[PDB]
Symmetry: C3
């Protein structure tokens, strides 16, 4: 179980994450209304939400997404798109571990995700901090699905500690690094990480533990099925590094489960 308020946040950032896949949301002019197609983000559309920055083909690995101003919810939202292009998929395959001593000693992260974040960190840090300067009353949130959730998690780990909190909501994110990094992500302050998984989605099981990867705690596991509406009683908070019994179970994984986080995600043209 989670609270109705936390459930509402989970649903809203799932929709911001879904919105990052719509092509028109990666080259939109600054100041325009954020919209999706196919009912992919009705709660985002209802809000007074506009683009501060929209990006595609950025850095290395085709970093894509947008930075949104949400005057209804008083948010600054950095939403990273997950995998769509060949370049995205090739980045995901760069799965050796690379030192990220500039985030934490002993920490190592996925080479592809960390290389992609490093290549855009200066630009996106500046954009976020400009938005905070203009709307210091607002809350900074980073979000994404799948690869986008990995990028949001690395970006939050890197950019926290500069005065403003950064909350991260990830949906179906892969593991992003080793046990040291998983522990760092569990205990870091200056914001909260909400790592959301769905049933037996394969993606949070990748890369496998045998390659030196671990998951941060906690996990918010959606137990309701694919195409089934989610309620607050279908989400289980699971504590512990590499905790079993949520998504990390020794059963058959599933691909369609990756595409259903409150609604369809990754499918907006």
């Amino acid at each position: 179980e989670v609270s109705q308020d936390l459930f509402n946040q989970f649903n809203l950032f799932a929709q911001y994450s879904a919105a990052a896949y719509c092509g028109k949301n990666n080259d939109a002019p600054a100041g325009t209304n954020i919209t999706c197609t196919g009912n992919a983000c009705p709660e985002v559309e209802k809000a007074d939400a506009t683009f501060l920055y929209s990006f595609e083909d950025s850095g290395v690995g085709d970093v894509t997404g947008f930075l949104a101003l949400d005057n209804t919810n008083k948010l600054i939202v950095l939403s990273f798109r997950g995998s769509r292009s060949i370049e995205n998929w090739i980045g995901n395959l760069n799965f050796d571990l690379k030192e990220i001593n500039d985030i934490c000693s002993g920490c190592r992260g996925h080479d592809g995700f960390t290389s992609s974040w490093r290549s855009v960190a200066d630009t996106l840090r500046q954009k976020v901090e400009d938005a905070v300067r203009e709307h210091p009353d607002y809350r900074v949130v980073f979000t994404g699905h799948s690869l986008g959730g990995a990028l949001a998690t690395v970006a939050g780990a890197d950019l926290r500690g500069n005065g403003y909190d950064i909350d991260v909501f990830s949906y179906g994110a892969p593991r992003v690094g080793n046990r040291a990094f998983a522990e760092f992500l569990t205990v870091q302050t200056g914001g909260t990480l909400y790592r959301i998984t769905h049933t037996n989605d394969i993606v949070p099981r990748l890369p496998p533990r045998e390659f030196g990867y671990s998951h941060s705690s906690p996990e918010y596991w959606i137990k309701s099925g694919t195409l089934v509406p989610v309620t607050r009683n279908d989400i289980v908070k699971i504590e512990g590094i590499d905790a079993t019994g949520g998504n990390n179970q020794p059963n058959i994984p599933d691909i369609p489960a990756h595409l259903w986080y409150f609604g369809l995600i990754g499918t907006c043209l």
Copy 2:
């Protein structure tokens, strides 16, 4: 076993379906001859068959294929390409069910397939009906492999009942809708659906039954192996909605089997 005449039709429309994947057959000038590369479609090439309308990047979901006039066999052939582009694949993942009451009461179809057809239906209907008017002695046939077979099935269901029959030949097609749609596609008058599957091809097993999908009856199951020439004795007709014992069996599915329907399909560059 099937009759030699039906076998000859199955082989011919497999080649029309293969031809839809050749890029040169999606942006060809009207009136030019239909050809493939290699031995992808020798029986189409032997016929006096020309393009009426060759299309790509159309509607939503990258609808691609051609409308052909076959003066040898006296056919008007609408052949849809299956999945090749990223956009095709994004459409395939829009696997929620959407109402299609304008086709049949209570029917629901795959959102991607039905949205794609809807986006091109007016244009393609007009072109088919223009050809029928000029060539009333010619038989109208819709065909395709995989996604293309799904589009041909939806299009046939929609455009039947306007004074001329439409036969549909699909090769390795996924399920396209709910039980009501499967029943409608089983009993609809004004043409026959020939739904052809091969051994343990995975695609006719998708989306899974659990998501609310069913298959129309009957099924023409090819039992001969991959790269094995098909004879009329290798094809078995299987009756019953969601029948088992043909392609819909609880065994390990296969990917190369999806590409061998009389010959290679999906591989023409």
Copy 3:
């Protein structure tokens, strides 16, 4: 175990193969240095290795790679990229056997790989032979990973016999033809083929034997794991057409194993 000298060659051509995947190495000015990103090819970077020719989306099937002049090792290296684009993948799926009598009597090869090579053979032969004339004491080596190793193997078989040796180093290459072709690749004069495999990489098990495919002899099998450094003691030479007990065993195959040949290969953006 292999000799330290052969190990050094195996490691170097693995890095030349990895370098062919970097986009910047497929369209670079002649005479400029070959480099990669993030330790994908440090031994190539250390050498005086410069572009003689670079190519992308050549011929049919998106033939991509480069021709290098290596003054440190006295090499002329033709490195073919493996699979990245959709077009590459479609070519891989063209897995029927096609006659290659003009390469060797009785030989049949994978339709995709042989069609791709035929479409670039004249141009690349001219580039290789121009380089030979300019540096007649350098050693001609063709190399590649996965599809790129298949192309290097077919190209070497075709272009040998014209007055200079051609050695081939392939990494995780699929089978490329029938038993006659496998025998020819085992016995052909005018160069040596070093066919390198890793643990239970699936790709050297494709297409399956049952489709009419065989492997040339010998095989150099890397027994160390994925993400594990290779030493010369971890490589075993296995002789015999279609020999078992190296990569060709009846156990479960693995995908990540395909990406680790001395280091990560196929992942350079």
